[PDB]
A paper describes a structure:
In contrast, we were successful in solving the structures of [name] with octopinic acid, noroctopinic acid and histopine at 2.1, 2.2 and 2.45 Å resolution, respectively. All ligands are well defined in their electron density maps. Octopinic acid and noroctopinic acid contain an ornithine moiety instead of the arginine for octopine. Local rearrangements of residues in the ligand binding site such as Glu36, Ala94, Met117 and those from the region 165–170 occur upon octopinic acid, noroctopinic acid and histopine binding compared with octopine, with Glu36 and Gln165 moving towards both shortest side chains of ornithine and histidine moieties. The ornithine moiety forms fewer polar interactions with the protein than the arginine moiety. In contrast, the pyruvate of the octopinic acid and histopine as well as the glyoxylic acid (a CH3 shorter than pyruvate) of noroctopinic acid adopt a similar position, comparable to that of the pyruvate of octopine. The same study performed with [name] showed that [name] displays similar affinity for octopine and its family members except for histopine, which is the worst ligand as for OccJ. The structural data of [name] with octopinic acid, histopine and an octopine analogue confirm a unique binding mode with a unique conformation of the ketoacid moiety, which is different from that observed in OccJ.
Two Agrobacterium ABC-transporters and their cognate periplasmic binding proteins (PBPs) OccJ and [name] import octopine and nopaline/octopine, respectively. Recognition and import of opines are conferred by periplasmic binding proteins (PBPs) and their associated ATP-binding cassette (ABC) transporters. The [name] OccJ is associated with the octopine transporter of octopine-type A. tumefaciens while [name] is associated with nopaline uptake in the nopaline-type A. tumefaciens. OccJ shares 47% sequence identity with [name] and belongs to cluster F within the [name] structural classification.
Author numbering: 28 to 281
Write the structure that this text describes.
Amino acid sequence: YKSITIATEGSYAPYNFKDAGGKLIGFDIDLGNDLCKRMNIECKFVEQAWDGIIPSLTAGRYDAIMAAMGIQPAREKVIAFSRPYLLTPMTFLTTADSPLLKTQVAIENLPLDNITPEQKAELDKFTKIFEGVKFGVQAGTSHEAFMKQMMPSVQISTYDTIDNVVMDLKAGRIDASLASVSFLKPLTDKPDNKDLKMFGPRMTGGLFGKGVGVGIRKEDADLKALFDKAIDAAIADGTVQKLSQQWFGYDASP
Ligand SMILES: C[C@@H](N[C@@H](CCCN)C(=O)O)C(=O)O
C-alpha cells in the first residue's frame, strides 16, 4: 500500500462530522490520520451515507471504514474488522422531564452475550415500559438492530441520520432513543442539551459485539494486519486515550 481511501459518515459527532468550512473532522478523522502515519500510508477521507457504507466497501469504492462502526457479528459475516479502537456500552436517551427517568435500573451494566433469567427479566421490564412510548432510531444501525431483535413489540420510527433522531426527540415527536455512551455523553454534556438525559442499563455484547473497529474487506488480510499493529501502538502510547478525551470528554480507549 502507498495510499488508501477511508469512508466516514460525516454526520455522527464527535466521531465524524463537518466543521464550519465543510471539512471532515472528529475522533475517526484524527485517529485515521494517526494510524496511517504509523502504517506509512497516504490517507484520504471520503463522505459516505450510512445505508451504502458496507456495500460500497465490498464493491471497492474505498479501502476502509472509520465511522463509529460497532464490531457486530451480523457485519462480521460481510466484512472484516480491525481489533477495537474504542470500547463503549449502549444506553437509552430521553428528555430531562420524562417520566421514564423515574424507572428503577436493577442491572447497571448489562452484558448480552449470555442472557440469564435475571438479565431477561430486566430487558422485559424495559420492553413493557417502552411499549407505551414512541421510539426513534437511526436506520441500519446497531440501535435499530437492538430494537428489532430485543424489543420487537416497541413502536419504532427510523431516521436517515442521528441528528434528525435528536431533533425529533427535542421537538417531542419521539419519547426516547438509544445510542452508545460515547455518542450520548458528549451530546448530553453540551449546555445546549441540559433538557436531554441518558438512562437505563448500560449494555454490552450480544448483537452489539465488542468495540468500534475499522471495517475492511475480508480478502485484505495484509491491510487488517497493518491497522491492527498501528492500533496496538496508538493505544500503548496513549494516543487513543488523548483523542478520546479531546473528542468525547472522557477515556473510552481499549
Ligand atoms: C458506536 C456507535 N455505533 C453505531 C454507529 C451509527 C453511526 N451511523 C453502529 O455501529 O451502528 C453508537 O452506537 O453510538
